[PDB]
Write an enzyme that holds these catalytic residues in place. Structure first.
Site, PDB file in Angstrom:
ATOM      1  CB  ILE A 102     -39.803   8.670 -32.399  1.00  0.00           C
ATOM      2  CG1 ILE A 102     -40.154   8.351 -31.148  1.00  0.00           C
ATOM      3  CG2 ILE A 102     -38.734   7.478 -32.860  1.00  0.00           C
ATOM      4  CD1 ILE A 102     -41.239   7.224 -31.250  1.00  0.00           C
ATOM      5  CB  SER A 151     -39.235  -0.387 -34.484  1.00  0.00           C
ATOM      6  OG  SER A 151     -40.354  -1.034 -34.391  1.00  0.00           O
ATOM      7  CE1 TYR A 164     -41.884   4.248 -34.070  1.00  0.00           C
ATOM      8  CE2 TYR A 164     -42.260   2.344 -35.164  1.00  0.00           C
ATOM      9  CZ  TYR A 164     -41.486   3.024 -34.024  1.00  0.00           C
ATOM     10  OH  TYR A 164     -40.645   2.437 -33.191  1.00  0.00           O
ATOM     11  CB  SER A 167     -39.698   7.142 -40.081  1.00  0.00           C
ATOM     12  OG  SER A 167     -39.950   6.568 -38.806  1.00  0.00           O
ATOM     13  CB  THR A 201     -41.469   3.286 -22.946  1.00  0.00           C
ATOM     14  OG1 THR A 201     -42.074   3.472 -23.820  1.00  0.00           O
ATOM     15  CG2 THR A 201     -39.788   2.820 -23.198  1.00  0.00           C
ATOM     16  CD  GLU A 202     -44.994   7.382 -17.659  1.00  0.00           C
ATOM     17  OE1 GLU A 202     -44.425   6.933 -16.743  1.00  0.00           O
ATOM     18  OE2 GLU A 202     -45.649   8.563 -17.432  1.00  0.00           O
TER      19      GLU A 202
HETATM   20  N1  NAP Z   1     -41.191   1.803 -26.469  1.00  0.00           N
HETATM   21  C1  NAP Z   1     -41.393   0.638 -27.653  1.00  0.00           C
HETATM   22  O1  NAP Z   1     -42.331  -0.206 -27.489  1.00  0.00           O
HETATM   23  C2  NAP Z   1     -40.311   0.694 -29.072  1.00  0.00           C
HETATM   24  C3  NAP Z   1     -40.604  -0.358 -29.985  1.00  0.00           C
HETATM   25  C4  NAP Z   1     -39.784  -0.195 -30.807  1.00  0.00           C
HETATM   26  C5  NAP Z   1     -38.889   0.670 -30.969  1.00  0.00           C
HETATM   27  N2  NAP Z   1     -38.658   1.783 -30.060  1.00  0.00           N
HETATM   28  C6  NAP Z   1     -37.678   2.766 -30.473  1.00  0.00           C
HETATM   29  O2  NAP Z   1     -37.179   3.308 -29.220  1.00  0.00           O
HETATM   30  C7  NAP Z   1     -37.112   4.837 -29.325  1.00  0.00           C
HETATM   31  C8  NAP Z   1     -37.368   5.355 -27.956  1.00  0.00           C
HETATM   32  O3  NAP Z   1     -38.796   4.997 -27.778  1.00  0.00           O
HETATM   33  P1  NAP Z   1     -39.449   5.325 -26.229  1.00  0.00           P
HETATM   34  O4  NAP Z   1     -40.795   4.669 -26.314  1.00  0.00           O
HETATM   35  O5  NAP Z   1     -38.582   5.434 -25.118  1.00  0.00           O
HETATM   36  O6  NAP Z   1     -40.077   6.919 -26.428  1.00  0.00           O
HETATM   37  P2  NAP Z   1     -40.488   7.800 -25.368  1.00  0.00           P
HETATM   38  O7  NAP Z   1     -40.363   7.471 -24.173  1.00  0.00           O
HETATM   39  O8  NAP Z   1     -41.890   8.467 -26.005  1.00  0.00           O
HETATM   40  O9  NAP Z   1     -39.424   9.011 -25.487  1.00  0.00           O
HETATM   41  C9  NAP Z   1     -39.324   9.980 -26.913  1.00  0.00           C
HETATM   42  C10 NAP Z   1     -38.153  10.957 -26.508  1.00  0.00           C
HETATM   43  O10 NAP Z   1     -37.956  11.677 -27.602  1.00  0.00           O
HETATM   44  C11 NAP Z   1     -38.193  12.901 -27.398  1.00  0.00           C
HETATM   45  N3  NAP Z   1     -38.929  13.705 -28.424  1.00  0.00           N
HETATM   46  C12 NAP Z   1     -40.036  13.603 -28.818  1.00  0.00           C
HETATM   47  N4  NAP Z   1     -40.211  14.448 -30.203  1.00  0.00           N
HETATM   48  C13 NAP Z   1     -39.035  15.093 -30.092  1.00  0.00           C
HETATM   49  C14 NAP Z   1     -38.515  16.148 -30.917  1.00  0.00           C
HETATM   50  N5  NAP Z   1     -39.154  16.758 -31.902  1.00  0.00           N
HETATM   51  N6  NAP Z   1     -37.020  16.634 -30.834  1.00  0.00           N
HETATM   52  C15 NAP Z   1     -36.452  16.037 -29.603  1.00  0.00           C
HETATM   53  N7  NAP Z   1     -36.800  14.876 -28.919  1.00  0.00           N
HETATM   54  C16 NAP Z   1     -38.162  14.607 -28.837  1.00  0.00           C
HETATM   55  C17 NAP Z   1     -39.300  13.177 -26.142  1.00  0.00           C
HETATM   56  O11 NAP Z   1     -38.892  14.045 -25.401  1.00  0.00           O
HETATM   57  P3  NAP Z   1     -39.668  15.582 -25.505  1.00  0.00           P
HETATM   58  O12 NAP Z   1     -41.098  15.594 -26.096  1.00  0.00           O
HETATM   59  O13 NAP Z   1     -39.523  16.395 -24.199  1.00  0.00           O
HETATM   60  O14 NAP Z   1     -39.067  16.413 -26.661  1.00  0.00           O
HETATM   61  C18 NAP Z   1     -38.464  11.845 -25.518  1.00  0.00           C
HETATM   62  O15 NAP Z   1     -37.490  12.254 -24.658  1.00  0.00           O
HETATM   63  C19 NAP Z   1     -37.589   5.097 -30.416  1.00  0.00           C
HETATM   64  O16 NAP Z   1     -36.736   5.313 -31.586  1.00  0.00           O
HETATM   65  C20 NAP Z   1     -38.774   4.233 -30.760  1.00  0.00           C
HETATM   66  O17 NAP Z   1     -38.730   3.973 -32.172  1.00  0.00           O
HETATM   67  C21 NAP Z   1     -39.433   1.863 -29.151  1.00  0.00           C
HETATM   68  C1  A49 Z   2     -44.969   5.674 -30.111  1.00  0.00           C
HETATM   69  C2  A49 Z   2     -45.634   4.313 -29.592  1.00  0.00           C
HETATM   70  O1  A49 Z   2     -45.283   4.258 -28.278  1.00  0.00           O
HETATM   71  C3  A49 Z   2     -45.000   3.400 -30.539  1.00  0.00           C
HETATM   72  C4  A49 Z   2     -44.914   3.230 -31.811  1.00  0.00           C
HETATM   73  C5  A49 Z   2     -44.416   2.091 -32.325  1.00  0.00           C
HETATM   74  C6  A49 Z   2     -44.170   0.895 -31.865  1.00  0.00           C
HETATM   75  C7  A49 Z   2     -43.472  -0.178 -32.263  1.00  0.00           C
HETATM   76  O2  A49 Z   2     -42.398  -0.304 -32.693  1.00  0.00           O
HETATM   77  N1  A49 Z   2     -44.132  -1.481 -32.230  1.00  0.00           N
HETATM   78  C8  A49 Z   2     -43.242  -2.701 -32.828  1.00  0.00           C
HETATM   79  C9  A49 Z   2     -43.322  -3.700 -31.835  1.00  0.00           C
HETATM   80  C10 A49 Z   2     -42.136  -3.093 -32.098  1.00  0.00           C
HETATM   81  C11 A49 Z   2     -45.558  -1.493 -32.376  1.00  0.00           C
HETATM   82  C12 A49 Z   2     -46.212  -1.981 -33.502  1.00  0.00           C
HETATM   83  C13 A49 Z   2     -47.741  -2.007 -33.366  1.00  0.00           C
HETATM   84  N2  A49 Z   2     -48.087  -2.536 -32.134  1.00  0.00           N
HETATM   85  C14 A49 Z   2     -49.481  -2.584 -31.861  1.00  0.00           C
HETATM   86  C15 A49 Z   2     -50.131  -3.626 -33.049  1.00  0.00           C
HETATM   87  C16 A49 Z   2     -49.704  -4.821 -33.338  1.00  0.00           C
HETATM   88  N3  A49 Z   2     -50.691  -5.718 -34.048  1.00  0.00           N
HETATM   89  O3  A49 Z   2     -48.730  -5.423 -32.529  1.00  0.00           O
HETATM   90  C17 A49 Z   2     -50.561  -2.592 -34.152  1.00  0.00           C
HETATM   91  C18 A49 Z   2     -51.881  -3.056 -33.172  1.00  0.00           C
HETATM   92  C19 A49 Z   2     -47.528  -1.883 -30.884  1.00  0.00           C
HETATM   93  C20 A49 Z   2     -45.976  -1.930 -30.950  1.00  0.00           C
HETATM   94  C21 A49 Z   2     -44.210   0.971 -30.420  1.00  0.00           C
HETATM   95  C22 A49 Z   2     -44.592   2.280 -29.634  1.00  0.00           C
HETATM   96  C23 A49 Z   2     -47.077   4.349 -29.671  1.00  0.00           C
HETATM   97  F1  A49 Z   2     -47.382   5.452 -29.026  1.00  0.00           F
HETATM   98  F2  A49 Z   2     -47.613   4.450 -31.133  1.00  0.00           F
HETATM   99  F3  A49 Z   2     -47.525   3.289 -29.371  1.00  0.00           F
END
Ligand code: NAP
Ligand code: A49
Ligand code: NAP
Ligand code: NAP
Ligand code: NAP
Ligand code: A49
Lengths: 265, 262, 265, 262
Positions: A102, A151, A164, A167, A201-202
């Site tokens: 993303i 998500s 977000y 998308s 995740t971090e």
């Molecule tokens: N963590 C959550 O709580 C959560 C919740 C719901 C859904 N998800 C989904 O899980 C997936 C991974 O999230 P994550 O938290 O593991 O993210 P993350 O740790 O921040 O990793 C983002 C990855 O995407 C890469 N990225 C960023 N901009 C880019 C670009 N322009 N081109 C190519 N790569 C790029 C970053 O590497 P570089 O910056 O080096 O390019 C990184 O490798 C996402 O689709 C996210 O929406 C996560």
């Molecule tokens: C990119 C990023 O790590 C991210 C962006 C969106 C999400 C996401 O998908 N989440 C849903 C639970 C799956 C978020 C939805 C938004 N919550 C925070 C909030 C909540 N009320 O839950 C708005 C305050 C955090 C998690 C998770 C992480 C962040 F940097 F925006 F945090």
């Protein structure tokens, strides 16, 4: 599509060839590690070669049949298209494409920032369509699989993630529509949409860090559930720490409205 | 959040409303109904000549007034300035009805990225641009945004993938900022309309080749009422079954659960 | 309770000892036949010895490890209690109790007929409690299973079956409550509630016979699904010809309200 | 099916209402509210002396009138004649509030059939007997049946098996005849009340040993409003979550689907 009738087994992935995008950190790096351990061939990508090289090296130590990376930004549709060709060449083909990356985003009220909305659409949705178009020929050869990470906020509404969420919703409309086209065209490539709650995740922990009160799910178990749903050709995988979520998230009405149309031309 | 009361045509009399996609189909029908209720109306679309004829039937039907400004919602500079122009003309904005779409292909998707991008730009990104341009005035009136959408922006259908992406994107974006406005106390409502098959000339051209179709003029009234009453969603299909199945109460339950995190 | 993690296999029932009530006709006779074919020991009951004897004979021809019947009416709580003792003696114990019988009923508007409401409560609900009380000692020995046949009209409301529906709803409240007691008392006897749509039994076909417009499901596949849910220790089995039903019938909210209580004393 | 309007205390003034289980707890609170609104009230329970004191506070509070008839709802002959007596006394019946229960054991179930039967007789079968006796008069007034029930008559809890059987039986019986009345055009409504923990002396005795408890007097008002407004269900718990989770929209969807069979 039709899921594999049978329990996941790690062996299913031995020798498979698998792209993971957004794989230098977070869930995608864990997916790369799980795939390595399974004896898969892997190509990983993201913008940062240094962080990618560490993943690659760790994957080899873990038992990866092979592992390589190619770096570039998914803002660039030409890179996106060419990366798939290069990757399929590095491995001799493609069994599974895992789209995960993303664009950098943070939690904020939406005001004024159309540039952020467009870039999210481009990187988080449109690049996924460009990857899938590039990949489809090889995946047709292999009867392969597309895995799309989405998500809870691509299913229901939250504040602070407006662009977000737009998308992630787009990915459900797009890939869910084309999954129905693959059924009527008899294309045997599965599409799995992963619907994740907060994962530890971090990047996420840094943003929600005693700033908002919620419980994170473990990133490694998340990553394996994604790969499993993919391997078993499931339509949707749900992963969240809360059981309210897992019980209430599915939408049987939508499935009925789809079935009613599906069965009358 | 909604209005206590039942709808009355007088709610719109004197009201200042933009309608996009108002040259043809449902958007034209809304321009009419709004005129027949005495609203001020600024309409838009690409068809200059056909907009002229629309703005004239509006005056005939009772509009407090009517103007059109022609342009393409492919162009974000135009979307942006259109709203400023439309507000100067009316001295404000009470309701922003966002209804236009780019032309859609009922075809299997194969490799046309350009068409996916363009659907996103016109069907979704323009809505956001217009909303950003209209908000200061809508805040000043406690106004309404009405966002026209589709069955295919709630469930999946083959042959309309790019369109359904753009319609699902709308739900995500606008349902999020609706949470945001609730928390930051912005008193602008957001209504999302979910339409089954409507008997517009566009739809009847595309599907010719049965599906039952609902009346475009009833449709357009339902949308305006929904918006006037400040409802979150309006559903309009000819099958009662369809409208039953469209509701997602689990989603609304889950959004409540999740809000106590914040 | 916890289901068996694994696919049903016919062998699971070989040598098992199984009571089926209401087994001289309809779904219960088919269950008796399916059990026979599986090599189970079976005791069947209902009011009519002649019709029961035919079931028994057919069960032996089908490969029943053993088969017997005992006749009496489930209006009589003494019969009900004694039948279980006699049955467990005939077989040397009890692995599964399948409660299936109902009182004769027809479709009619409710007017005046409290006697019908009471008899339905007695035969369709109270007798099931009396059977379960009689059976529980043997079932505890075997870590066995209680299977309770209910109906869509023990889950949602229809006209014309007011007394019947009262009795099927009562079974859900009663056995579902005691299932929660078996969890906190550590009693390893499963309880399966079967929720059936219209099934093509002779009594039902006679009543709905071009009189009301609906599609019946096959009675033999129904009977096997019941036995399977039972064997695999599932909480609820749903069986109907319509997919609207199977998607919309489960109630995740109820499961959440139960879990919220379960986890706070 | 419901009433268009919001509740007004005047809806009950002059109304002829039976309340069962009215010696103690919620049923006593309903007798009060109904008196404070000027209803005619006939109350019942086993406690003769305590009913006397109830019927007197009702007169003090404004009842158009008040009577009690004491007896046990273990006895179906009494249930039956009580309704005839209560109707002669008022010259009719507008609303039948069915609220009594036999005493419940919070215990594991082991082998007490007698208690399961008795719960069924008093908690369920008496409701049906009373309904059968009251229907001619309620048909003549386009009246209402109100049926008091419980979380445990919608979901499963350990320790209350016989009680939950009887409360689920009520839902089944009364929700069926409600379909029946819709089809045969009987203009008597049926309201089912689903209550979480209420702070009555009975409940507070049983659970002493936390659970948050809702006010018995608010509870009793909610029930009367529900019935006055002709609603199908009333839900009353102290947790908003609980009241969200109690709704079963799939069930109501499925009942619509299934009705086109008929
Ligand atoms: N963590 C959550 O709580 C959560 C919740 C719901 C859904 N998800 C989904 O899980 C997936 C991974 O999230 P994550 O938290 O593991 O993210 P993350 O740790 O921040 O990793 C983002 C990855 O995407 C890469 N990225 C960023 N901009 C880019 C670009 N322009 N081109 C190519 N790569 C790029 C970053 O590497 P570089 O910056 O080096 O390019 C990184 O490798 C996402 O689709 C996210 O929406 C996560
Ligand atoms: C990119 C990023 O790590 C991210 C962006 C969106 C999400 C996401 O998908 N989440 C849903 C639970 C799956 C978020 C939805 C938004 N919550 C925070 C909030 C909540 N009320 O839950 C708005 C305050 C955090 C998690 C998770 C992480 C962040 F940097 F925006 F945090
Ligand atoms: N009718 C249905 O069966 C159906 C079903 C579901 C949802 N809906 C929704 O209802 C809304 C109206 O649909 P409809 O059937 O009324 O469609 P329509 O008759 O084709 O009208 C679309 C309107 O958008 C305008 N438009 C097209 N391209 C434009 C552009 N580039 N820039 C600015 N305006 C442009 C068109 O005018 P110009 O060409 O003059 O520019 C026309 O006025 C849409 O949002 C649609 O998704 C309709
Ligand atoms: N068929 C359906 O469409 C349908 C739908 C939903 C649920 N179900 C459930 O499935 C089960 C079986 O129904 P079915 O249609 O197979 O019924 P059926 O064919 O009519 O069989 C009823 C069985 O119960 C016995 N029975 C009747 N009164 C009895 C009494 N007083 N004592 C002991 N046995 C008695 C009958 O034998 P005797 O008269 O000889 O005593 C018969 O063996 C029931 O619990 C029913 O509610 C059926
Ligand atoms: N309070 C709660 O936490 C709770 C929760 C869920 C549902 N509810 C429902 O609310 C209703 C009232 O409950 P409550 O807490 O108010 O109970 P309560 O205070 O114990 O009152 C029960 C009423 O029923 C009468 N009654 C008991 N046995 C009777 C008999 N054999 N014949 C005739 N009347 C008899 C009692 O009076 P006598 O002993 O004088 O006869 C008393 O007036 C019940 O339907 C209950 O299930 C309450
Ligand atoms: C005993 C009897 O065979 C019976 C009694 C009740 C049911 C029953 O459980 N059914 C639900 C679908 C599972 C019935 C519910 C009532 N339908 C007919 C009706 C309908 N609208 O579906 C009321 C007309 C027939 C099936 C099935 C059969 C019958 F004789 F009453 F028919």
């Amino acid at each position: 599509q039709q899921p594999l009738n049978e329990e996941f087994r790690p062996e299913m992935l031995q020798g498979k060839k698998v792209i993971v995008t957004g794989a230098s950190k977070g869930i995608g790096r864990e997916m790369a590690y799980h795939l390595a351990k399974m004896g898969a061939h892997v190509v990983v990508t993201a913008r940062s070669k240094e962080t990618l090289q560490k993943v690659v090296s760790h994957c080899l130590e873990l038992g990866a049949a092979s592992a390589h990376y190619i770096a570039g930004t998914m803002e660039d549709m030409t890179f996106a298209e060419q990366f798939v060709a290069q990757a399929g060449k590095l491995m001799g083909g493609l069994d599974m494409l895992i789209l995960n990356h993303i664009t950098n985003t943070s939690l904020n009220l939406f005001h004024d920032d159309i540039h952020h909305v467009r870039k999210s659409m481009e990187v988080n949705f449109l690049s996924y369509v460009v990857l899938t178009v590039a990949a489809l020929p090889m995946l047709k050869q292999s009867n392969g699989s597309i895995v799309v990470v989405s998500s809870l906020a691509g299913k229901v509404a939250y504040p602070m993630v407006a662009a977000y969420s737009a998308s992630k919703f787009a990915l459900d409309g797009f890939f869910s529509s084309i999954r129905k086209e693959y059924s009527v065209s008899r294309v045997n490539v599965s599409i799995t949409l992963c619907v994740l709650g907060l994962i530890d995740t971090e990047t996420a922990m840094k943003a929600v860090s005693g700033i908002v009160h919620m419980q994170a799910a473990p990133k490694e178990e998340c990553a394996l559930e994604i790969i499993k749903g993919g391997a078993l050709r499931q339509e949707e995988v749900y992963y969240d720490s809360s059981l309210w979520t897992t019980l209430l998230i599915r939408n049987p009405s939508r499935k009925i409205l789809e079935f009613l149309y599906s069965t009358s031309y």
